[PDB]
């Protein structure tokens, strides 16, 4: 079975969402070159699928709260070139993560993680996972209780 080493939390980040990016080649490139040009370090990038109804999708990334505004300013300056409809900025997020390995063979782990947070009324704003981590963003004021819930749910 899987190994779970701990729970990590981070209150230092913001999320930037580029809304309504055209889902055709070259558009993520424009976004990320802009962010790199702005010298903004990126923690997580997440982009789900477009739906055929609009042929657009959103891209979210997280960065330190101190440089979020520079990222927003840069993307905003390239609205015509990039073709997005809106930017959202949220600097009130907490990131909470379950740390471990071998989680892909245990779908019950992801379910338990989400059940643990649900049971204490924490809303999962965003989810990203890997072989070694399940990470979610929640409101920063919900971060502590999310941490406690995961500690209890996983015996950590």
């Amino acid at each position: 079975d899987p190994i779970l080493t701990g729970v990590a939390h981070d209150r230092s980040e913001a999320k930037v969402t580029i809304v309504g990016l055209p889902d055709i080649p070259g558009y993520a490139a424009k976004v990320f070159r802009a962010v790199a040009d702005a010298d903004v370090n990126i923690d997580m990038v997440l982009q789900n699928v477009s739906k055929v109804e609009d042929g657009k999708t959103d891209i979210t990334f997280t960065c330190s709260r101190d440089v979020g505004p520079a990222a927003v300013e840069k993307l905003d300056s390239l609205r015509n070139e990039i073709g997005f409809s809106q930017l959202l900025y949220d600097d009130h997020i907490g990131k909470v993560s379950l740390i471990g390995a071998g989680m892909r063979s245990h779908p019950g782990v992801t379910a338990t993680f989400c059940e643990a947070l649900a049971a204490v009324g924490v809303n999962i704003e965003l989810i990203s996972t890997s072989e070694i981590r399940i990470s979610v963003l929640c409101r920063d004021t919900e971060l502590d209780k999310a941490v406690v819930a995961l500690h209890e749910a996983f015996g950590l």
Binding site: D76, Q86, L87, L88, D90, D91, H92, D140
Partner: peptide, 11 residues
């Protein structure tokens, strides 16, 4: 469309 400053629960 104007940037939305989200997360505050405010106007």
């Amino acid at each position: 469309e104007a940037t939305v400053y989200a997360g505050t629960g405010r106007l």
